[PDB]
Design a binder for this molecule. Structure first.
Ligand SMILES: O=C(NC1(C(=O)O)CCCC1)c1ccc(-c2ccc(NC(=O)c3nc(-c4ccccc4)oc3C(F)(F)F)cc2)cc1
Ligand SMILES: O=C(NC1(C(=O)O)CCCC1)c1ccc(-c2ccc(NC(=O)c3nc(-c4ccccc4)oc3C(F)(F)F)cc2)cc1
Ligand SMILES: O=C(NC1(C(=O)O)CCCC1)c1ccc(-c2ccc(NC(=O)c3nc(-c4ccccc4)oc3C(F)(F)F)cc2)cc1
Lengths: 585, 593, 593
RNA sequence: AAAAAAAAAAAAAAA
């Protein structure tokens, strides 16, 4: 809709029945005209933000990864007050801004074509905010829209939404007041594939009032309820994607990429063919070696031997042969899993690594615990203080104080490396937040337990799924310190490997798609797998959920099976945790 | 004067008649003897500071620019107080220190010979400060003197001064009490050329009491008054330069530089000759397109073809080819302007770009505005709060609190680039301060309007003179929020192109300097021009002023014409702004009372 | 002892007679199993910490030094409370953490084989702390143990201990309450060589109550008392080293280094041989030049000549020839000192450089002073304020407030360099701490002098031992401000060069080892010397001491002589600076009352 | 981390 000369606008409607209806408006052609693409987004003519996308002129090939940057700028005048810091100006980004950056980055990063090396930056500035609303999902939609309008090698629009479960109804774009009446809150992002919605990213939690609401007659959030919520999110995502596509079509764009960006593939076809022909049997034999150290040294000497010949023939190109060896090893591992259902460490597909839990490991600490799963080792420590030591928060969001604080540390020596020790990175902030929200729903009220609580997790050894280990360790340490939890909580990380491998028959035209679900995946299995998701909760319902995928469709039965498998593992871990301690000390 | 063996001293006198006399003393040969040059500067026996200059042993020829760095270190013991921070120690530099660094850097940077690639650093430490005095101009003088004594490829001494207009007299080096009785105060820096003072840098503002003083019978600071003030600062600059030169002569130095520094020109002469002979006609034709996208595409194609062919011929030397192409383009643009009075975008020499102004653009904002000039686009937002949210200042200078705050932001996408988004840089601080001082003299008193005020400017699009756009946007947004200003304010930027071109005749000896003044310059005209002169004010008098120039002298009539043209442009912009809003609105329901 | 499958532990006992006995326990095989080495250390089953050591897979040859890194992580839950900062989380390291990092780094860094280029990182995390205990020395032991256990090219275990002098007994690992009754406190680190303890690192101070304790009848800490304290620490170090070695043997390791680390020597044998054969006599004569400027000019001429001669022959290698020339020049200077007792500047073995002291240099400062020793030049400034301006400290240690603060600044221009100016480095923190502790024992009580005191030292020129110069300047400036000190304090830096050379005779296999002690060493002498130590105090006893060495044994007579020589120099300097001021002045009118 | 050796329009990961 051309409201003005050069200005275009589109609208999408979210109908929540008796809970109301909301409108989202996208506008382009008026602000920030020197960027590659720019969009202004409105929610209910009271929430307003701007998103701009640009790209660098020259490729940059000293890097070996795709350089993408996302930034969120929260302006205090959007809340109508002056910043409280000593210099009266906005400083480093807050935790909410970092979490929003991660939410945008996770689904968009894999949507670009492989091998790109130009810098790409997305900046989202918050301009106006209603006190009872949340801006993160709106920001996701705006970032997608500006990237789409920028004429870059980007795979279609991406839509994001939040759904909350209130009195048996899934409500889209709920307010803070409505969230206070819900039992479960979930952010979902996806895209449209051949007329159907494919889920890409999920982040969900249980609310802080869930136990009381369930005692009043509400339905608890079990696995089937979560699946139903995922199904209910799809129509909203479809509507948002349609609005973005209409905006792109109206303001030209569509085709005519004009500027063409080069691509830098990891390796050439001939190098890969030679590497396969020379090392297929060596790698196949090596992967059958039980143990860790001997297998690692066998693989290392295979690498040094193979690179000693092909590099000389291919005129001093060792990175290409290394990449080809990585690709061949990954393919072999996937094929072995798909055919024999045999994992690299020898486990079955439903097996968990060796578990152990212990309490009272730091002499003067108020509470402490040590939790081990395979080579993953987490130490948790809890301290208690007067209620005045709760954190005071000054930001755009509605939160003003923080009674329970959780901090997560990941030192380089946990993986045998060296590196800078200093401020936490974005990934540490994200992992800490996930564990914190996993624990929030099981906590006594201020009236019955008037203390400020700080929990610290330190990853002393890491081989995959450190967040779930921190969840378990925090439950153990809180019990050891005498906090009266409503119920213990545990978590697990699951993986999925899918492929269209041949089935019983011939002709090679009867291939059917197959899926395999893996319990308690290692780091390598995450790197080589097709989907990974983490589940935490009690023995009655889920408290936290996180999922990332890139497949173009997942049958419902596969997801139901995966959720049930995760629940079984969670119960098995809860039994071992209870053996160490089963009531507050 | 050798007061002690190896120690030399020189003095300069500033005579203000019935307002008093002041003395400035330079000393060398006693402190910091391992630096390349070092000087101690005194003002009235009570203000004392130290300046030191050093240079790196080896060059960095892979750099594309001259790496000069300036640092100002404020010590709290200069005021007899312990720092108030949690660790009781000086931390990151304050806004005053950053502004002083910019003041030193602007005139000194062009004074070095081009092509230099050694690192040069200047550090100024404040040792003792009288509560009623300012140290910035003294610092400019000391930095110049230490660099002059360091035996570097530096062009002559530079002198800097402050002048304030009190009862029709321009007083040099005024105190805080004297400044609060003035209507205008201005900092000027220059050098001596063929026995006359050439002005290089200017920074001026009207005071916060100007309206009340003018109502009481004082003369308002119009254009002619400001020009007279510029003329009155020259004798002081000459005296300061003479004192510095005498100090340099006394302590040896002067000749025999001893250390020789290499130079790295951007391109060779043969490369320039080839580029010219291959591309002159193509470039001349391309500049006639005058339609941006087509012109940009044509220039890019010409550049690609030339670099390809000349890299084939010269075996992979592309940087010099690019530099030569840029220099040739600059020469053609300047010649077109000087001969035919044609600009890049097809404007006359006095024309302003298309203007537009709008208010109430952010829904839950106390006031907001959008201001556009051709391709520069500024968004301004106002917020109001209780008087206790005023900024508390704990610096070395006399200021203790700030009722009105202005912050300026310049994101990378404003010009289509990618870069880091973080803490503001020094240039952002400078632009913000310039826009802030243009509005102070018009704000209402705290008794009438008891609120703290914060203004934010965001440069959504940048193609030249973003600070003047910030001034206009702040006026609009403040009016939209219900602040009762005394008068609206607006601003503009001006440019210059000059050279020695033979007048109609012969003998090649009648060559004389010729000047052309441009209104509302583009970014490219600033890059290829000879100066950048920003003027802001009301319809009655000027409120803020900033100038930097690289030439060796501008005739007074040229500046007078520039000021008059700027005033005409300002009036046009004010009329356009008033058409959009001409009186304060009602206060927003979301604001406090 | 294998308490559990794969878990080993060992114990060391420390017996203080009637003052009690303590135990230190080392454990491995349980925590942090992916690091190269990891150890847990316990003190009295109430203090607990963890240390981990890792190494990078590949070397890096573009560095010209050994990249070792040490980090100390203080966790606030070890004290059982939530951090007090706005974000409720631990931020940048505190001063105590930095000092502990340097205490670990000083003895361990020279203990690795030269030429190593892999990254080595050590991280020590504090897990549990008793309120009346100190964790720094326990951390030193743990870092040594984890490095030893990692199978790296590391020369044997290193032990560290603290001894405090109480009622004539040297107590090991004292508590805070016990230190409150001591006159002297000393941290010592060493290692076992051919069955005897060789001292490597010392850092010592006098307590804040020393004057009153000595008035009460205790013995003052003179030079002989400090020597006795150094002797009393050896058995504890031996026991700690033995426990570490037993732990290493029990858990395998010992042999089988497995991982081989390449080494990158500075120069080859042939390059050194040619450089010597072509430059021996040419450099020998240049060192006889008494003029520093002529000396360095000739030296750089010779370097350029040798470089341009030998670059062609060795296919171009400037770094190797430069390194060989450095080794040759250092060897020649050492031989000259050992044989003729001559120094670079022609001084005698006990001579001090020219001294000068002056007060009242900054006009408005409460007190100020300028101190010069040869080419070293320090400016000191004092500030006084209300007692509420004392620093408030929030950390693990028992300290909670800081009445006297000392800050030390080392700008790049003090050596004629360019560099970043801003937050201080670790070395500045260390030097400031040393000067602060040197002054603490001479200070009036709060009841007698109710003020907060801030002292700032600025190194305007540096050529060697700026920290002792800071001590002298602080005494002068404090007297000038009117602070009633109990006695003045001065300091000096000393060097020692040792070697085994032939004695008058024949056979050439009867060489004997000799030592030469140097007073007030230059920077070059420190670079080319074998040991350096700094001593400060009054005319009656020592207040601070710092020592670093790598020799495998020092006779007691040599050390006694060195201490006496330092005392003589200190008395001479005190006499010189009493001429400038001998009693406190009247308080400045600008200071509060 | 060891050591004396800013000017201009031009973050992802176990690694
Ligand atoms: O700990 C973690 N924690 C995190 C968590 O989730 O919380 C913390 C925050 C996020 C992660 C983590 C730990 C380890 C990994 C990992 C991934 C891949 C490989 N890669 C191989 O391991 C390999 N490389 C080869 C090969 C190499 C060269 C030539 C030929 C082959 O072969 C192989 C072979 F199959 F043998 F196993 C190792 C480790 C990831 C995550
Ligand atoms: O806003 C601005 N600054 C600030 C302000 O507020 O003021 C904002 C924040 C602080 C200050 C600003 C914006 C843009 C510019 C700019 C300048 C020059 C060019 N350069 C060409 O534009 C060009 N380059 C060529 C050429 C190049 C190589 C080879 C051959 C030809 O030709 C040409 C041709 F003349 F055509 F136009 C572009 C943009 C400057 C300032
Ligand atoms: O100021 C200081 N302050 C500090 C303090 O302690 O507080 C502050 C914090 C720690 C230090 C300091 C000042 C100077 C040094 C230093 C060290 C070595 C050399 N090096 C030569 O000095 C030399 N180099 C040559 C030569 C070179 C190349 C080719 C051939 C010859 O010859 C020679 C010859 F020995 F003769 F004198 C110079 C200065 C150290 C510290």
């Amino acid at each position: 809709a051309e409201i003005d000369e050069g200005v275009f606008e589109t609208t999408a409607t979210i109908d929540n029945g008796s809970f109301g209806t909301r409108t989202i408006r996208f506008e382009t052609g008026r602000l920030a005209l020197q960027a590659a693409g720019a969009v202004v987004a409105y929610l209910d003519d009271d929430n307003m933000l701007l998103s701009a996308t640009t790209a660098s002129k020259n490729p940059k090939e000293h890097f070996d990864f795709f350089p993408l940057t996302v930034d969120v700028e929260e302006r205090m005048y959007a809340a109508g007050r002056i910043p409280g810091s000593f210099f009266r100006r906005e400083g480093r980004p807050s935790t909410d801004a970092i979490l929003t950056c991660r939410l945008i980055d996770r689904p968009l990063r894999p949507s670009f074509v492989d091998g790109l090396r130009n810098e790409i930056q997305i900046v989202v500035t918050i301009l106006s905010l209603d006190p009872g609303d949340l801006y993160d999902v709106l920001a996701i939609n705006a970032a997608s829209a500006s990237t789409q309008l920028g004429g870059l090698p980007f795979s279609g629009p991406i839509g994001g939404v939040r759904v909350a479960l209130i009195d048996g109804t899934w409500v889209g774009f709920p307010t803070v007041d409505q969230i206070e009446r819900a039992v479960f809150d979930m952010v979902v992002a996806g895209r449209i594939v051949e007329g159907d919605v494919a889920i890409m990213m999920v982040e969900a939690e249980a609310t802080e009032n869930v136990v009381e609401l369930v005692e009043g007659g509400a339905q608890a959030p079990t696995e089937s309820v979560v699946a139903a919520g995922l199904e209910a999110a799809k129509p909203f995502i479809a509507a948002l994607c349609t609005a973005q596509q209409e905006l792109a079509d109206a303001a030209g764009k569509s085709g005519k990429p004009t500027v063409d960006f080069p691509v830098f593939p990891d390796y050439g076809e001939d190098v890969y063919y030679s590497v396969s022909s020379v090392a297929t049997d060596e790698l196949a034999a090596a992967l059958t070696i039980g143990g860790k150290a001997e297998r690692d040294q066998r693989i290392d000497e295979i690498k040094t031997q193979v690179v000693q010949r092909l590099a000389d023939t291919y005129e001093g190109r060792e990175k290409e042969v290394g990449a080809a060896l990585r690709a061949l090893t990954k393919k072999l591992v996937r094929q072995r899993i798909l055919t024999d259902h045999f994992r690299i460490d020898g486990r079955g597909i439903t097996d968990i690594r060796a578990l152990s839990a212990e309490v009272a490991v730091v002499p003067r600490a108020h509470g402490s615990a040590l939790f081990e799963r395979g080579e993953t080792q987490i130490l948790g420590v809890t301290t208690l203080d007067m209620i005045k030591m709760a954190q005071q928060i000054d930001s755009l969001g509605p939160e003003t104080s923080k009674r329970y604080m959780h901090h997560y540390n990941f030192p380089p020596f946990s993986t045998g490396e060296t590196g800078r020790v200093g401020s936490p990175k974005r990934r540490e902030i994200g992992h800490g937040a996930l564990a914190e929200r996993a624990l929030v729903p099981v906590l006594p009220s201020v009236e019955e337990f008037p203390y400020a609580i700080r929990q610290v997790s330190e990853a002393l050894g890491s081989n995959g799924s450190t967040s779930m280990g921190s969840v378990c360790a925090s439950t153990l340490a809180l019990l050891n310190a005498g906090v009266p939890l409503k119920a213990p909580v545990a978590g697990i990380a699951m993986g999925l490997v899918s492929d269209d491998i041949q089935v019983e028959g011939a002709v090679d035209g009867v291939v059917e798609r197959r899926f395999v679900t893996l319990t308690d995946i290692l780091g390598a299995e995450d790197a080589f797998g097709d989907m990974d998701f983490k589940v935490a909760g009690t023995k009655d319902f889920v408290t936290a959920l996180q999922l990332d995928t890139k497949l173009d469709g997942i049958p419902s039965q596969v997801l139901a099976g995966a959720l049930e498998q995760a629940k079984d593992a969670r119960l098995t871990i809860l039994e071992v945790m209870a053996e160490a301690i089963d009531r507050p000390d």
